[PDB]
Amino acid sequence: GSEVEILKALLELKKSTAELKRATASLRAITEELKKNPSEDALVEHNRAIVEHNAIIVENNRIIAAVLMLIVVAVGMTQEIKKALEELVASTAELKRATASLRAITEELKKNPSEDALVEHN
Amino acid sequence: GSEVEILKALLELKKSTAELKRATASLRAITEELKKNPSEDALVEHNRAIVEHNAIIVENNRIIAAVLMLIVVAVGMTQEIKKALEELVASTAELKRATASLRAITEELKKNPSEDALVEHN
Numbered sequence A, B: 001g002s003e004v005e006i007l008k009a010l011l012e013l014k015k016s017t018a019e020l021k022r023a024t025a026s027l028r029a030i031t032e033e034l035k036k037n038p039s040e041d042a043l044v045e046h047n048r049a050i051v052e053h054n055a056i057i058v059e060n061n062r063i064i065a066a067v068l069m070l071i072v073v074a075v076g077m078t079q080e081i082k083k084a085l086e087e088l089v090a091s092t093a094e095l096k097r098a099t100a101s102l103r104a105i106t107e108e109l110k111k112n113p114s115e116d117a118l119v120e121h122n
Helices: A002-034 A041-075 A078-111 A115-121 B002-034 B041-075 B078-111 B115-121
Strands: none
Touching: A002 A041, A002 B002, A078 A115, B002 B041, B078 B115
16 A cells, blocks of 8 residues: 555655756756847747746645655554454444343342342442 | 946956856756766766855855945045045134134233223134
8 A cells, every 4th residue: 555655755756856956957057058148038938937837846746745645644554543443343342242241130130139130230 | 446446346246146157057967967877976076066166256256245345335435525624624724713813812802901802802
């Protein structure tokens, strides 16, 4: 379950990091090459839009991974919860047996109020 | 005076800005190209040192310009100070003339205490 989902989240962080590094490299290549001749308006404006789009995508990937890590941590407790439930089920069944026993004792004690029945009640 | 010094400070800001933009571009080109093969240790370590040196130089240029602007502003007031001094000198000379006149009046009033001398005193 979470063993693979988390490995994929780590792969995502690796890829969004590489994207950030490359987007930053183009950000700078753009500033240095385009300031040489501002008349190349389409090239500088298109590349700046590209850089902003990548920066947003990187930030979104970070947030998405941050949320999915909370889902993953909830998932990783599956076996601990399963064992807690098995214990709760066994406890419920034992409580039921004790209740049925007490009911039978109550009926026996009222029908035949022997001292032994009072001892069994306690 | 300050007319040229300030133009040079502006030229400095232009050149340190161009340096910053280029140093940043190499910072990124270095990260993206060197992470491809970390075994090229000398190239990545030398270029990172280059980037740190340039970043420091840019910060120093900013501080130096900030101080020189204070010297320049002090320099630009040369004519206002010169005129204030011309006024102060004329005032001092007038005060001296008034003092010498008063001394002569005092001598005349004591030697010949005519009412006119008292009027001149006041």
